[PDB]
Structures are given as C-alpha cells and as structure tokens.
Amino acid sequence: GRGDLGRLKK
Amino acid sequence: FNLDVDSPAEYSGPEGSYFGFAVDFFVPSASSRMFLLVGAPKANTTQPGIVEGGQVLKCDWSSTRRCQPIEFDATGNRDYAKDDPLEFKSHQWFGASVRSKQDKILACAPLYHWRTEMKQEREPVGTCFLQDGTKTVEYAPCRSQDIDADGQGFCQGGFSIDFTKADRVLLGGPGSFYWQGQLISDQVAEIVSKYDPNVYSIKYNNQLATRTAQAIFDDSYLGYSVAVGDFNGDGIDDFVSGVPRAARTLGMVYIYDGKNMSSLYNFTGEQMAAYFGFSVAATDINGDDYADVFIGAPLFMDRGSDGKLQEVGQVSVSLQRASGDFQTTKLNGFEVFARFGSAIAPLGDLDQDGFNDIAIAAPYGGEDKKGIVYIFNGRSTGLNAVPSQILEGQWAARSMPPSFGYSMKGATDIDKNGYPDLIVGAFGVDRAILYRARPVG
Amino acid sequence: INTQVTPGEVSIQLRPGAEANFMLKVHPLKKYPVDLYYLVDVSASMHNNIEKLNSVGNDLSRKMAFFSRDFRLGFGSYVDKTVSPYISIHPERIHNQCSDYNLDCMPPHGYIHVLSLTENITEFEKAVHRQKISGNIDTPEGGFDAMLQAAVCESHIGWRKEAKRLLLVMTDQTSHLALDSKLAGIVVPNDGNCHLKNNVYVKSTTMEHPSLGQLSEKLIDNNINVIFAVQGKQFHWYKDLLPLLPGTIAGEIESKAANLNNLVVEAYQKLISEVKVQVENQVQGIYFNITAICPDGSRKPGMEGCRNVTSNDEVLFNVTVTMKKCDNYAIIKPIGFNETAKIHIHRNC
Ligand SMILES: *[C@@H]1O[C@H](CO)[C@@H](O[C@@H]2O[C@H](CO)[C@@H](O[C@@H]3O[C@H](CO[C@H]4O[C@H](CO)[C@@H](O)[C@H](O)[C@@H]4O)[C@@H](O)[C@H](O[C@H]4O[C@H](CO)[C@@H](O)[C@H](O)[C@@H]4O[C@H]4O[C@H](CO)[C@@H](O)[C@H](O)[C@@H]4O)[C@@H]3O)[C@H](O)[C@H]2NC(C)=O)[C@H](O)[C@H]1NC(C)=O
Ligand SMILES: *[C@@H]1O[C@H](CO)[C@@H](O[C@@H]2O[C@H](CO)[C@@H](O)[C@H](O)[C@H]2NC(C)=O)[C@H](O)[C@H]1NC(C)=O
Ligand SMILES: *[C@@H]1O[C@H](CO)[C@@H](O[C@@H]2O[C@H](CO)[C@@H](O)[C@H](O)[C@H]2NC(C)=O)[C@H](O)[C@H]1NC(C)=O
Ligand SMILES: *[C@@H]1O[C@H](CO)[C@@H](O[C@@H]2O[C@H](CO)[C@@H](O)[C@H](O)[C@H]2NC(C)=O)[C@H](O)[C@H]1NC(C)=O
Ligand SMILES: *[C@@H]1O[C@H](CO)[C@@H](O[C@@H]2O[C@H](CO)[C@@H](O)[C@H](O)[C@H]2NC(C)=O)[C@H](O)[C@H]1NC(C)=O
Ligand SMILES: *[C@@H]1O[C@H](CO)[C@@H](O)[C@H](O)[C@H]1NC(C)=O
Ligand SMILES: *[C@@H]1O[C@H](CO)[C@@H](O)[C@H](O)[C@H]1NC(C)=O
Ligand SMILES: *[C@@H]1O[C@H](CO)[C@@H](O)[C@H](O)[C@H]1NC(C)=O
Ligand SMILES: [Ca+2]
Ligand SMILES: [Ca+2]
Ligand SMILES: [Ca+2]
Ligand SMILES: [Ca+2]
Ligand SMILES: [Ca+2]
Ligand SMILES: [Mg+2]
C-alpha cells in the first residue's frame, strides 16, 4: 500500500 | 575577509512575519536602481478574507531601509460555485521562496491549497506568481486534473525555485506522487503567454517535468531544494536538486540535463538521517570555468575525540572536472547543533583574486545560538577549508531563535564598487542584513 | 554509596603536561525493578497489530517476574503531527481520517499519554482494550517526537529513578526526521522539553521533530533504554540507526505479532547484559582515555564497552586523564544505568 490509509484502501 | 561587518545595512519587517525567510537582489537593468527582495511567508496582507497569506517586499538601498510589498495578487479566494470556494489563500506561505533574474520576480506559496473540480477537497498544490515587469502572471504547474496524494495534489509546488540562464524557471515540488517529489521547468515566455485567469489548470507545451517512479521512491522529497549550472558541457544550465530522504534517508542530489530533464549525475549521503541534500548550490569555486557542486547535510553527526557522536553538520564540496566526474571534499561544522550547511550562498569573487568564494551558514551556532555565517575563499586547488571570515548574528532570541544565516544571497555588486556583496536573512527576528565587500574599484 | 558504579566520586590533581589515572568498576546487580512503557503507533497502518496488545499484560508480567524485582507497565500512543500535508484537513476527513473507508477512526493526535507506569496489570489490559485506531496520509509517522516527550516527561509517565527504565516504541513505518517539518511550515527547532498538558502533547503542531543527536542526548540523560518493536521491512531502518543511538535495541514483530512478549524479554536480557560508558568531559583542556577491561580479558575502547555481562561479575574501566592546556568535573556514566561516577578535577596553572 501507499500512504497510511493504503492498508484500508487495499 | 573583506566583508564590511562594521556598518551593515539592516532591514526589518512586521513582527512574526518571518521577514527574511527568503532574500534576493532585484536588478532590472532597464532602470539603474538596485533593490533587495525579502520574503515574508507569514505576513498579513490586504487580500479580502485572507489571513497570513504572505508577502514579498522590495527594499531600497539608496540611503533608506524602507520596504514596500510587491502587489503580486490583491484578490481573495476564487469561487468554484455559489458558496463553494475554489481555493484557500489563508496560511499559504507566499514568499517562502523568491527569485529574480533581471527584471522578472518569481515568488511562490508552497502551502497554498485548492479545491479540485471533481470534489470538495483541500489539496496543498502550492502556487507561484511571476512578475515580468509590467505584467504579473500566476504559475501553478502542480495544480491540475490528475491531482491527489497519488498525483500532484500534495505537490507543494514552488517549495524551491531557481532561474535558468536561458530564461527558464526551475520549480521543485517535494510532495507529488506520495511525496516522491518532482521537478518542473517551463520557459518564461510560455508561462506569460499561456496564462488565462479563468483556466485553473493551464497546459504548457514546452514544459519539462520529471515523472512518477516506483513506490520505493515515496517520501523522497525530490524538489526540497534546487540549483542550476552547466554540468554536461553544452552551455545549457542543468537542474540540480536535493532529495534529502532518498536512499533510506541517506539523502541524494540528482542532476538532470536542462535540455530534456534527463538524469546525468547522482550524489548520495553517507550517514542516515543527516539530510544530505537539504541545501544545494552550484558555482565554479576553483576558477576553471566548470561549475562545482555544494551540498549541505546540516544534521550530520561526527565522531568526536572520545568516540561520541556530535551533530555539527557537513557541506560536501565537489569540484567538477573535464573528464565528466567530480572530486569531493567534506567540510564539517564547528559547533554542535548549529546546523552547518543549512544555507550555501555562492559569493562570486568576493575579493577579486580570480577565484569565486562561497558562504555557508550555521543558523543556530555562535554565542547564544544566534546564528553564524562562514566565508570561504576559492583557490586553484579548490575551496580554502579555513573560513577567511566569520559573520555573527547580532539579534537576541525572541520566542523562537534568531536563525541568522537561514537564507542568504550574494554575487551582486549592489553598490557598484566592483566587489560582490551579500544579504543575510534572520527570519526568527524578522531581519535582513546587507554586508558590503570592502576593497582590497 | 553507589550500588553498581564504584567509586561514585573521585578527586584528582593535575598539572600541565602531566597525567593521572584511576580504575572505575561497574557491577550490575541481580534483579532490577523494571519500568516498561508501551509507546504504540496507533495509525491506520497498525490496525491488525493493535488488537494483539491485549496479550502483553498478564503473560508478560509472569514472564518478567523471573528477571525483575518488580515489573511496571504503561501505555501511550502517537500517529503524527495534525497538520497538512501529513493529514487531510478537509472538515470531513480532518477528525475522521478513515471517512472514505468507513471505519470508526479516532481523531489524529501527536502523542497522548494514556496510562502512567503502574503495578496493576488490569489497568494496562483495560486501557489497551479500549484504545482505537487513528489515521493520516503519509507513511512516515511521528515516532521520534513522542519518544522524546515520553523520555523527558518524568513525572507524567512515572519513571522511577530506582528502576531499569524501558521505553518500547512499537511501529510499522519509518519516523519523521527533524527537517521534514518544513513542508508544514514548521521551522522552529525542537527544544527537547516536556509539553504534556492534559496528557496530550500540545506542541506537536508548532515545532519540528527532534534530530537523532537530540533524541539520543535526551534518552541517555534520562537513562531510557529504548526497545524498537517494528513489524515490516522498516525494521532494518531502525536497526541501521542503532549505531547512531547508543543504548537502543530493535526487535522484529512477526507478521502476526505473536512474539511481542518474547521480544520484550529478549531485549531486556540483551540490555542488562551490556555495559558501556561515556564521559561528559566539559572540563576545558583535559582529555580522557577510557579503556574497558572486559571480564574475559579483552581491552575494548570503552565507548563500545563489553557484552555478555552478568551479576557476580564486574566490568573494569581504566580511565587515563591527560592535561593538555588550562582555562570543574567530568561524569563517566554507564549508559542505561541509574548511577554515575563524578570525576572532580582540581589543578593549578
Ligand atoms: C539516480 O538515482 C535515481 C534513483 O535511484 C535513478 O532514477 C531511477 O531510475 C530507474 C531506472 O532508470 C527508474 O526505474 C524504472 O525503470 C524502468 C525501466 O524498465 C526497464 O527495466 C526494468 C528493470 O527491472 C524492466 O523490468 C522493464 O521491463 C524494462 O526493461 C521503467 O519502466 C520504470 O517506469 C515504470 O514504472 C513507473 C512506476 O510504476 C511508471 O510510472 C512508469 O510509467 C513505468 O510503468 C511501466 O512499468 C510498470 C512496472 O510496474 C508497469 O506497471 C506499467 O504498466 C508500465 O509498463 C522506472 O522508470 C526509477 O523510476 C528512477 N527513479 C527516480 C526517482 O528517478 C536515476 O536513474 C539515477 N541516475 C544516475 C545518473 O545515476
Ligand atoms: C494576522 O492577523 C490575524 C488577524 O486578522 C492575527 O490573528 C491572531 O491570531 C492569534 C493566534 O495566532 C490570536 O490569538 C488573535 O486573537 C488573532 N487576532 C485576531 C484579531 O483575530 C494574526 O496573528 C496576524 N499574524 C501576523 C503574522 O501578523
Ligand atoms: C487493579 O485495577 C482493577 C481495575 O482496572 C481493579 O479491579 C476493579 O475493582 C473495582 C473495585 O475497586 C471493581 O468494582 C471492578 O469490577 C474491578 N474490575 C476488574 C476488571 O477487576 C483492582 O481492584 C485494582 N487492584 C488494585 C490492587 O488496585
Ligand atoms: C539505582 O538502582 C538500584 C536498584 O533499584 C537502587 O537500589 C535500590 O534502592 C532502593 C531505594 O531507592 C532500595 O530500597 C533498594 O533496597 C535498593 N536495592 C538494591 C538491590 O540495592 C539504587 O538506590 C539506585 N540508585 C540511584 C542513585 O538511583
Ligand atoms: C591502566 O592504565 C594505566 C595507564 O594509565 C596502566 O599503567 C601503565 O601501564 C603501562 C603498560 O603496562 C606501563 O608502561 C606504564 O608505566 C603504566 N603506568 C602509567 C602511568 O602509564 C595500567 O597498567 C592499566 N591497568 C590495566 C589493568 O590495564
Ligand atoms: C537528452 O539531451 C542530451 C543533450 O543533448 C542528450 O545527450 C541525451 O541523449 C538526451 N536524452 C534523451 C532521452 O533524449
Ligand atoms: C587513547 O589511547 C590510545 C592508545 O590506547 C591512543 O591510540 C589514542 O590516540 C588515545 N586518544 C586520546 C584522545 O588520548
Ligand atoms: C557469557 O558469560 C558466561 C559467564 O562468564 C559464560 O559462562 C558464557 O560462556 C559466556 N557466553 C559467551 C557466548 O561468551
Ligand atoms: Ca548542460
Ligand atoms: Ca570548477
Ligand atoms: Ca576570492
Ligand atoms: Ca560591493
Ligand atoms: Ca504519517
Ligand atoms: Mg502508519
């Protein structure tokens, strides 16, 4: 992921 | 050794405005007069409904120290629709970076935000305004349609700027593509002619810009600082920029060819978190007509006598050679936590040996951490590694440290006595100081 | 007087061009009262990890009963500075940074002190249980700033001077460096002082992160033995900063976070088995040459010290003091120990 919220996005 | 510290001219701005955060010289040369350009990123302006927008001031030298803001923009925020502001010029930090070529003035607002057309956002794209004598034109390359944290939405364009010899602007945005950073260059003639106030995303045909890279390059901060000089021997200034968080925070400095933004040379730091690439400068210091690279690493930690690390800072002096390579010399700081290498201002030939000089600042060094500026002379061998002169900040600390030497500019003979002078900014106390080189015209 | 570092006070005489020397003994004892503070990364990248903190209570206390006279626990959290470009400052995303992804995310904060060091493990378990996730945009997170605030705020966290202070910093990402803060317009150097008002770090939004030298200085000044618990590939980033941060350990959290207690116990064992000193030589014109006579017979350069030390076992530091010139005292302390040797130095010139 990219960014701190990339985990949520993924 | 010949800079006049006895009687330097002093310039002051509004309290808390960060006056002196950026300094430069304005020499239109169509009129014979000379001015100092001082950036005040947190100054209050007369724009309707804008608080701490920022300013760039034009300061006289002739027998007075008065300063007048340059009216780059007098409007408030434009509206995308009814009760729907397009942009947010409050706390935009206008004047954080200022540049002037002959009669042009380029000043930028890195923390300018705007709301994209697609949705209601607040994207720190940053914006620049180019004054070209009679005309004033907005330059906001990083605000566009393809903007997000993924794109140029957080670009903060204009965080660092420079002027190319052949009349191009070099602009670095540390934040684009998840803080991979980016450099953008376009010709001034195209910037001033393609400008339309009603188009929020202007296209530029001959614009050179670096592109997106792998995810491993994220948070590199390409465009943290920029400089220009000829490095591949074709007469066109190349783009030198610092990338302080690259290579796992070792830091890097890239050189891109000015003709096509093609990468030429890479520098890499040798200590993690030292911020190799905070400051970058290019000048020919040894007088062989080849431009030499100066790179600051203000957080560098040096092993002391006992083996204890001391954060003194470092400046890498890299002399260019005809073979297409460099010879690097490390110049360490003199005091702990002074941040030697924060600013690197080439001076030209301060004393006319035939060899250019350079000034390096440690904005938190000296007595009471007032800030100190070190002057180093040039030689046929390279840079004389012993400071020929010391410049000490005079102003005591207010709520924040004076930060004397945080911003500095030289290589201009403002008094027309044949010897280049130097301007130093202390934004912590809202001061700018001019030092005039004494004769050894 | 001193229980571990003897002699605690030394007085010597010197004259220009002369020298002097004495033997310093550092003797670890059998059991230490342990203060362990859990400074956690509560960003949106640690959602799978935070739920596993429920297991570091009772089990960790029973594990550490065998190595400590008594064991304390505390909790604290950080995500980042709450300013652009680090967070989204749109009014919808400003206080619920996971709005687009529809999670019940807490508003972002710089550094919040949740629970002071206490011997009641149930308090720690409950405080851990109720704690939720916050968010921001960029991957690097303000670990170092919260670390400095935890180290320097003695009375707030509850560090005991009699205790073997441990500060565990748990994260999955690199931390922000001092001059990163210029992107937000924060250009005021960190002063290193304490600014916890209502258990919240208020100056996170107005002054930049600390530099590695400043953090190291303030950690060693307070005898904080830092353990880095890092999950992803960013562990090696912290492992590579250990030479720049004396007295710091780094441990790898396994992908499921199943080793978070073995991590602490192993790091504590490594900590108490290493003795290394440094000298606060502020005396003008006098230089120190300290060599560590390790129990195995090695002559290490002192600054690196010796390893695999135990109790019933003393490390000997051979201190040679030279006068080169003239115009006070110097302090030789083993980093991570709660006692120091003060070398008062008289002279005539
Ligand atoms: C100074 O130091 C800097 C930093 O290290 C260095 O810049 C970096 O240079 C490298 C190489 O020039 C860049 O890396 C990539 O290069 C490939 C080239 O592709 C060929 O080689 C690879 C080798 O693995 C093969 O796999 C491939 O098949 C080719 O043979 C480019 O393709 C890369 O760009 C792609 O990826 C980007 C990010 O995903 C995309 O934005 C881009 O459009 C390209 O997309 C393509 O590839 C994707 C891969 O996932 C694919 O998904 C897409 O669909 C599409 O097919 C990239 O350029 C690296 O980016 C540079 N980084 C920076 C910050 O500049 C300098 O070269 C160095 N200079 C000097 C003088 O030393
Ligand atoms: C610019 O002007 C604004 C007011 O238009 C000033 O705002 C003050 O901000 C401080 C906190 O920073 C508040 O305590 C004051 O109450 C505000 N004043 C008013 C009238 O609202 C701001 O300080 C000014 N900034 C500079 C650099 O001059
Ligand atoms: C340790 O803390 C726990 C709670 O964190 C205390 O247990 C609570 O005690 C109160 C009475 O004082 C009860 O009403 C609660 O139901 C208890 N909760 C739990 C979870 O047990 C406990 O008393 C504390 N121990 C000491 C020695 O202070
Ligand atoms: C350094 O730490 C040791 C270990 O805790 C301290 O020794 C204890 O001191 C307390 C009083 O603070 C006594 O009640 C204990 O009996 C001591 N234990 C042992 C094993 O000696 C020591 O006092 C500390 N010294 C300083 C200067 O902080
Ligand atoms: C501790 O250091 C002192 C020096 O400060 C050592 O004493 C010297 O040892 C050398 C080598 O044996 C002799 O040449 C000198 O004459 C000794 N005296 C001085 C004043 O230098 C001493 O041996 C060291 N002790 C240990 C245990 O290593
Ligand atoms: C970029 O321009 C330089 C200078 O003419 C040239 O040597 C180089 O081959 C060019 N590279 C590309 C990719 O166009
Ligand atoms: C310390 O002593 C060593 C010899 O053991 C010598 O090599 C070194 O130069 C000395 N350093 C100082 C600062 O006295
Ligand atoms: C560590 O020290 C103990 C005690 O002297 C000794 O028994 C053991 O062999 C040592 N271990 C190593 C690896 O040197
Ligand atoms: Ca060129
Ligand atoms: Ca040269
Ligand atoms: Ca010269
Ligand atoms: Ca002059
Ligand atoms: Ca972050
Ligand atoms: Mg995170």
Among C218, C242, C272, the domain-final residue is C272
| Residues of chain C by 3-state class (helix, strand, coil), percent to 5 | 25, 30, 45
Order of strands across the sheet with B3-12? B3-12, B431-437, B421-426, B407-412
The three-point CA angle B371-B374-B375 to 5° equals: 145
Within this chain, do residues C186 and C295 fall inside the same structural domain, yes or no?
no
What's the domain range around C74? 32-272
Question: Half-sphere exposure of B394 toward its Cβ, with a 13 Å CA cutoff?
Answer: 13
Q: In sequence order, which residues have a C-beta less than 8 Å from that of residue B63 and are 6 or more positions away?
A: none
The span from the CA of C34 to the CA of C163, in Å, is 5
Between chains, do A5 and C47 touch, taking CB under 8 Å as contact? no
Between chains, do C98 and A8 touch, taking CB under 8 Å as contact? yes
Amino acid letter, B166: A
Q: What is the DSSP string of C249-315?
A: EEEEPPTT-TTHHHHHHHHHHHHHTEE-EEE---STTEEEEEEEE-TTS-EE-SSS-EES--SS--E
Element (H or E) spanning B191, and its range? helix B188-193
Q: What is the DSSP string of C78-124?
A: E---SSTTTS--SHHHHH-TTTTTT--PPPP-SEEEEEEEES-HHHH
Q: CA C298 → CA B369, C272, C291, C306, C315, distances in Å?
A: 42, 19, 10, 9, 11
- Residue closest to C76 by CA, chosen among C170, C192, C178: C170
The span from the CA of B291 to the CA of B283, in Å, is 5
The span from the CA of B300 to the CA of B311, in Å, is 6
- Residue closest to C45 by CA, chosen among B221, B122, B1, A5: A5
Within this chain, do residues C173 and C245 fall inside the same structural domain, yes or no?
yes
Q: Obtained via which technique?
A: cryo-EM
Q: In sequence order, which residues have a C-beta less than 8 Å from that of residue B12 and are 6 or more positions away?
A: B19, B65, B430, B431, B432
Within this chain, do residues C291 and C254 fall inside the same structural domain, yes or no?
no
Element (H or E) spanning B3, and its range? strand B3-12
Lookup: tokens for C233: 């590939």
Q: What are the structural domains of chain B?
A: 1-438 (2.130.10.130)
Within this chain, do residues C218 and C229 fall inside the same structural domain, yes or no?
yes
Lookup: tokens for C243: 């030479």
Lookup: tokens for C34: 């342990």
Within this chain, do residues C183 and C260 fall inside the same structural domain, yes or no?
yes
Query: In 10 A of CB C279, how many CB atoms?
Result: 24
Among C211, C245, C272, the domain-final residue is C272
Within this chain, do residues C175 and C60 fall inside the same structural domain, yes or no?
yes
Those chains having 3 or more beta-carbon pairs within 8 angstroms of chain B are A, C
Work out whether strand C164-171 and strand C225-230 pair parallel, antiparallel, or are unpaired.
Answer: parallel
Which residue's CA lies nearest to atom 2 of ligand 7?
C289
Within this chain, do residues C288 and C209 fall inside the same structural domain, yes or no?
no
Cβ < 5 A residues, ion ligand 10: B 284, 286, 288, 290, 292
The span from the CA of B370 to the CA of B401, in Å, is 7
Within this chain, do residues C80 and C150 fall inside the same structural domain, yes or no?
yes
- Residue closest to B345 by CA, chosen among B427, B280, B439: B280
The span from the CA of B85 to the CA of C127, in Å, is 43
Nearest residue of A to residue B218, measured between CA atoms: A2
Which residue's CA lies nearest to atom 13 of ligand 8?
C308
Looking at the CA of C311, name the nearest ligand. 8
Q: Among B179, B219, B241, B254, which residue has the most ligand 1 atoms within 8 Å of its CB, making it the best to mutate?
A: B254
User: Which CATH number does the domain housing residue C80 bear?
Assistant: 3.40.50.410
How far separated are the first and last CA of chain A, in Å rounded? 7
Q: What is the DSSP string of B129-147?
A: EEEETTEEEEE-TT-SSS-
Within this chain, do residues C44 and C166 fall inside the same structural domain, yes or no?
yes
Element (H or E) spanning C19, and its range? strand C19-26
Query: In 10 A of CB B413, how many CB atoms?
Result: 18
Within this chain, do residues C133 and C243 fall inside the same structural domain, yes or no?
yes
The span from the CA of B186 to the CA of B169, in Å, is 6
Within this chain, do residues C304 and C210 fall inside the same structural domain, yes or no?
no
Among C237, C254, C272, the domain-final residue is C272
Q: Among B260, B261, B263, B264, which residue has the most ligand 6 atoms within 8 Å of its CB, making it the best to mutate?
A: B260
In this structure, what DSSP letter does residue C213 have?
A: H
Asked whether B399 and B372 are in contact (CB, 8 A), the reply is no
Within this chain, do residues C327 and C205 fall inside the same structural domain, yes or no?
no
Q: What is the DSSP string of C140-163?
A: -B-HHHHHHHHHH-HHHHT--TTS
The span from the CA of B282 to the CA of B345, in Å, is 9
User: Which CATH number does the domain housing residue C295 bear?
Assistant: 2.60.40.1510
The domain total for chain C is: 2
**B213 alpha carbon – ligand 1 mean position (Å):** 6
Resolution (angstroms) stands at: 2.7
The span from the CA of B212 to the CA of B181, in Å, is 9
- Residue closest to B424 by CA, chosen among B352, B344, B323, B317: B344
Q: CA C348 → CA B379, C14, C20, C288, C325, distances in Å?
A: 45, 7, 14, 18, 11
Question: Half-sphere exposure of B262 toward its Cβ, with a 13 Å CA cutoff?
Answer: 4
Asked whether B173 and B163 are in contact (CB, 8 A), the reply is no
How far separated are the first and last CA of chain B, in Å rounded? 17
